[PDB]
């Protein structure tokens, strides 16, 4: 992948191995210099133009802000640039935007949503395709995140564990993200343990949370506020006053006042 003139083509010179530190700093100058031309954003002002300074180059500008952002673990070079990358593909429906990188960058970030912890946002991007079985299911790239969030929330870890381990994508498409997806399977075990186990042995932890050392086990209990004693570990999960938001629960003082109003002030509307 050689280059030609501008910095967009020059990003492919270092694309082979590493050297993504200087490629992220070349994003602001190449984005500003292309603004002087009115053909940069692929709007309808053009007429049948796939050539440079219109579309094909715009797909290769944000590759460093997407491919290398996942490799080098940078979320600041992705979010708004990806929100700006979405209209480049299609405004409503476009059949000429198909590419091998469309089913990759999108499928990897759907699992990255655990930072915001939104289930609705995960399945929201899956409803924007006119074809599902042909696109999502028939492709192993887009079917990987679907099989996880489906099987993880239903409670079956074992069937979802062999997908990452014994899957055929371990050679190429699985490189950067590991601990995020691997721990997400065992992150919901402790959240389900609050009302489940009153005690757990140290021997059975290796079969559940996959902790071979007691250091990581105790460090997780300190942030989650659990008592640690000799032999097994006692579980309590005690609550406190003024729980979260959504008033008329535990928040406003004397909730019966509104009940008194419903027995008195509500009768005002009955008469007049």
């Amino acid at each position: 992948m050689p280059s030609l003139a501008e910095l967009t083509k020059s990003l492919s010179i270092a694309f082979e191995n590493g050297d993504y530190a200087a490629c992220e700093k070349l994003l602001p100058p190449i984005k500003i210099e292309l603004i002087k031309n009115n053909l940069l954003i692929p709007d309808l002002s053009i007429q049948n133009d796939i050539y440079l300074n219109d579309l094909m180059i715009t797909k290769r500008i944000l590759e460093v802000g997407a491919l290398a952002s996942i490799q080098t673990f940078n979320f600041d070079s992705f979010e708004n640039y990806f929100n700006q990358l979405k209209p480049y593909y299609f405004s409503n429906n476009h059949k000429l935007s198909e590419s091998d990188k469309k089913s990759k960058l999108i499928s990897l970030y759907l699992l990255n949503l655990l930072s915001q912890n939104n289930t609705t946002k995960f399945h929201s991007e899956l409803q924007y395709l006119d074809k599902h079985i042909k696109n999502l299911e028939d492709d192993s790239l887009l079917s990987y995140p679907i099989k996880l969030d489906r099987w993880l929330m239903e409670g079956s870890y074992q069937k979802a564990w062999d997908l990452l381990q014994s899957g055929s994508q371990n050679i190429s498409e699985f490189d950067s993200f590991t601990d995020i997806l691997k721990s997400a399977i065992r992150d919901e075990i402790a959240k389900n343990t609050e009302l489940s186990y009153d005690f757990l042995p140290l021997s059975n932890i290796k079969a559940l949370l996959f902790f071979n050392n007691e250091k990581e086990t105790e460090k997780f209990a300190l942030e989650r506020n659990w008592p640690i004693v000799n032999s097994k570990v006692y579980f309590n999960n005690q609550s406190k006053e003024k729980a979260d938001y959504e008033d008329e629960m535990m928040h406003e003082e004397d909730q019966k006042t509104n009940i008194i109003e419903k027995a008195m002030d509500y009768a005002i509307s009955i008469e007049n």
Binding site: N92, H94, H123, I189, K191, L195, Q255
Partner: protein
């Protein structure tokens, strides 16, 4: 000059009836023929001082040609013209303002929101909540079926159940029509019958035949033997042979909740609802999966609130908490809040009419 222009307002939707159904040839040129009404002698002529002269059926015939995928398909398969149409659909939203569109504004977002099924961002609907607050002027005839019909699929994302009960009635209210009996009535019971298997029960298997074909709801009746009874073995044999029936619109994606209820309702057919249970008794019915992973089945339903239980690591002692103290303080109050507002609901309508 003056009166002659007003008398021609009703002449729009008259001659456009015979251009639908039978003759479908190039219906996007009809949109350009509609543009002869739209831009001249409407927006650039009127002062926008009128309300009842604009109806939702004016541009409603546009999107009806997009799902054909045979004759029209826009003017090209690339669908690049819908970019202007996207701004054209929202062109009347800018016309809607504080002093403009006190009625038609209610029917603007609807067809735009009904367009968001397979195309268009559905996350803007959360942003449309800011502009969603308006007083409802009136409901006439066919509105009741046109609100949440396509919107009954919103619950196919957020993963919610009890909400689907309240909004599924909108699909069955005044659903059958002359041309909508075959077309739009079938999709009503398809989304209605699956929700009946999520929480409640189906009143009768033959009661749904008067509206929707029983063969269309036939696989859902076999899912009652599987999903409602919580059986994984009979569920896989049902999806395999009826997969051809799952090729319809959004009939495959509802299977995600059908296989999840197998675990959720499967706990109910198992004796876990009873207090004292052991794991060795649990492994009998769940043997179709595995032994050590059963602890993940019960614990997952505890955080969601389906059933609470305590699991032992040695013999698998299962002690499920049965609450006989409920419906005492603040638990019935959620229902009491509804019973209070029912009195003045129908009483204030007496002062209006």
């Amino acid at each position: 000059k003056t009166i002659e222009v007003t008398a021609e307002i009703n002449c729009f939707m008259h001659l456009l009836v015979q251009l639908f159904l039978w003759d479908s040839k190039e219906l996007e040129q009809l949109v350009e023929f509609n543009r002869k009404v739209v831009i001249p002698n409407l927006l650039c002529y009127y002062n926008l001082r009128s309300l009842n002269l604009i109806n939702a059926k004016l541009w409603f015939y546009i999107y009806l040609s997009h799902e054909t995928l045979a004759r029209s398909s826009e003017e090209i398969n690339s669908d690049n013209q819908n970019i202007i149409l996207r701004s054209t659909m929202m062109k009347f939203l800018k016309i809607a303002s504080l002093k403009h569109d006190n009625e038609t504004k209610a029917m603007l977002i609807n067809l735009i929101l009904r367009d968001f099924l397979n195309n268009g961002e559905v996350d803007s609907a959360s942003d449309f909540i800011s502009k969603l607050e308006y007083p409802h002027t009136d409901v006439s005839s066919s509105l009741e079926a046109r609100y949440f019909f396509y919107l009954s699929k919103i619950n196919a994302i957020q993963l919610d159940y009890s909400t689907a009960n309240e909004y599924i009635i909108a699909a069955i209210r005044k659903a059958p029509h002359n041309s909508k009996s075959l077309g739009f009535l079938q999709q009503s019971n398809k989304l209605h019958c699956c929700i009946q298997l999520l929480m409640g029960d189906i009143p009768e298997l033959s009661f749904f035949h008067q509206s929707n074909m029983q063969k269309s709801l036939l696989p859902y009746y076999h899912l009652t033997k599987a999903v409602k009874l919580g059986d994984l073995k009979k569920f896989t044999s049902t999806i395999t042979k009826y997969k051809q029936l799952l090729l319809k619109d959004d009939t495959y994606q509802l299977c995600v909740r059908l296989r999840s209820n197998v675990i959720k309702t499967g706990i109910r057919i198992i004796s876990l609802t009873y207090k004292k249970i052991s794991l060795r008794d649990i492994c009998l019915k769940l043997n179709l999966d595995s032994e050590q992973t059963v602890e993940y089945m019960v614990s997952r339903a505890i955080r969601d609130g389906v059933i609470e239980a305590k699991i032992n690591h040695e013999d698998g002692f299962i002690e499920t908490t049965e609450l006989l103290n409920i419906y005492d303080s603040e638990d019935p109050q959620q229902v009491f809040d509804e019973r209070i507002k029912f009195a003045n609901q129908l009483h204030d309508e007496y002062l209006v009419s």
